[PDB]
Write a protein that binds this ligand. Structure first.
Ligand code: GCP
Length: 414
């Protein structure tokens, strides 16, 4: 007997156009976004790739083949049941991680990361090296480099890459980074991969009783044409619990909440409505919590949720220490080189009265720095961020040419 629990952790998977994308998660999980997702999504447009999978490790068997994903501990000559472990969730970027459409949404979700790089591809790959950059900028705790396409080339050439990876990871934040040989469209050493996922990207440490905070990443009016008024419920909220515990029947609010349309000015009056329900993937749960992705039932006017309206917001408890600021101050230390198309450019330090792009967890606001110092500056954002911890991390971007590109990171000071 294996218990049905909500995901408990969250791992993102990125890399160049190097294969397999969704295929690797699929090689670990099953059916999900973004073409179907059942029984979850009844249609959609673009967005990210989400899939959670059970993970159990079999005691009777031998490492690493002892690692399983379902209760069928067959391939070890024993009828014994595994020891139920974790409920890992996987999220990936179908083409929005970096360089295009920066939201940081899923980026704040990373309890770890998998940098996949095809072995048939010369390392380091252009786009992949900038992927490794964001992993240090957004500071994803615990990552692993998975050599894909290992089946394409000899182990010996599979080591010509190993060199280059170790060579690329000389004196960086990741020296003990794992490099896992794995196969794409085929299932080779995937279980060993699991092992590492169970060692390097370990089950996180959290505090059961802290400030419940969820981060709206999408919202939609679930009622489709033909739902009669007598029978319908307020649109749900996407997002993910980052701290604390949420329950049904529990009163919460979203910040900054609803914008105010009056006079010649504009503000934001936070929206107060309760949690109708919880539901992780297929099943409908009872007490939302960190790890994995969730969707919350509500009493809002669906007009408010429809079309990912609230996304980039933040769900917090009915009443709490929830500073919403039209001006922020962040310590920092930016980079010196910006990579991308063609070759890396020379990026100057933050300029005064300049408009930068600030991504705070689930949000991405453009603000103007109203005073610069060495380790710190103040930014006049156009949309009120909803700070909550002196430790929160913001990603700064500057529009060099057409759009914005990551240039540094810093903590919000309050
Ligand atoms: N977790 C959870 N999600 C719910 C619940 N009720 C409705 N939903 C959400 O409603 C969605 C149903 O999809 P759909 O009604 O077609 O809206 P949509 O995904 O925006 C599709 P379209 O873009 O065509 O309008 C699911 O993805 C699910 O997240 C619930 O009680 N719990």
């Amino acid at each position: 007997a294996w218990p049905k629990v909500q995901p408990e952790v969250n791992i993102g998977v990125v890399g160049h156009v190097d294969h397999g994308k969704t295929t690797l998660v699929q090689a670990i999980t099953g059916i999900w976004t973004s073409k179907h997702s059942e029984e979850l999504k009844r249609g959609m447009t673009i967005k990210l790739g989400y899939a959670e999978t059970n993970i159990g490790v079999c005691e009777s068997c031998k490492k690493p083949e002892a690692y399983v994903t379902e209760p069928s501990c067959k391939s070890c000559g024993s009828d014994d049941e595994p020891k139920f472990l974790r409920r890992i969730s996987f999220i990936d970027a179908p083409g929005h991680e970096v360089l295009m459409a920066t939201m940081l949404s899923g980026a704040a979700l990373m309890d770890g990361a998998i940098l996949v790089v095809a072995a048939n591809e010369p390392f380091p790959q252009p786009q992949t090296r900038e992927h490794f950059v964001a992993l240090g900028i957004i500071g994803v705790k615990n990552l692993i480099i998975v050599q894909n396409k290992v089946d394409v080339v000899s182990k010996e050439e599979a080591l010509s890459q190993y060199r280059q990876i170790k060579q690329f990871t000389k004196g960086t934040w990741a020296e003990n980074v794992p490099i896992i040989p794995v196969s794409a469209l085929h299932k080779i050493n995937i279980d060993s991969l699991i092992e590492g996922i169970e060692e390097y990207i370990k089950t996180p440490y959290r505090d059961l009783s802290q400030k419940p905070v969820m981060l709206v990443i999408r919202s939609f009016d679930v009622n489709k044409p033909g739902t009669q008024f007598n029978e319908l419920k307020g649109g749900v909220i996407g997002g993910s619990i980052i701290q604390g515990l949420f329950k049904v029947d529990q009163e919460i609010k979203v910040l900054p909440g609803l914008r105010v349309e009056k006079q010649g000015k504009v503000s934001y009056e936070p929206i107060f409505t309760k949690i109708s329900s919880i539901r992780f993937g297929d099943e409908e749960f009872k007490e939302a919590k960190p790890g994995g992705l969730v969707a919350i039932g509500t009493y809002l006017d669906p007009s408010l949720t429809k079309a990912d309206n609230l996304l980039g917001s933040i769900i917090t408890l009915a009443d709490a220490e929830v500073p919403v600021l039209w001006n922020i101050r962040i310590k920092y230390n930016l980079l010196e080189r910006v990579v991308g198309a063609k070759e890396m450019l020379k990026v100057d330090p933050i300029r005064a009265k300049e408009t930068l792009m600030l991504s705070v967890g689930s949000s991405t606001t453009l603000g103007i720095v109203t005073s610069v110092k060495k380790d710190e500056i103040e930014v006049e954002l156009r949309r009120p961020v909803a700070v909550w911890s002196n430790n929160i991390r913001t990603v700064i971007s500057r529009q060099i040419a057409g759009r914005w590109r990551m240039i540094g990171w810093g903590l919000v000071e309050i």
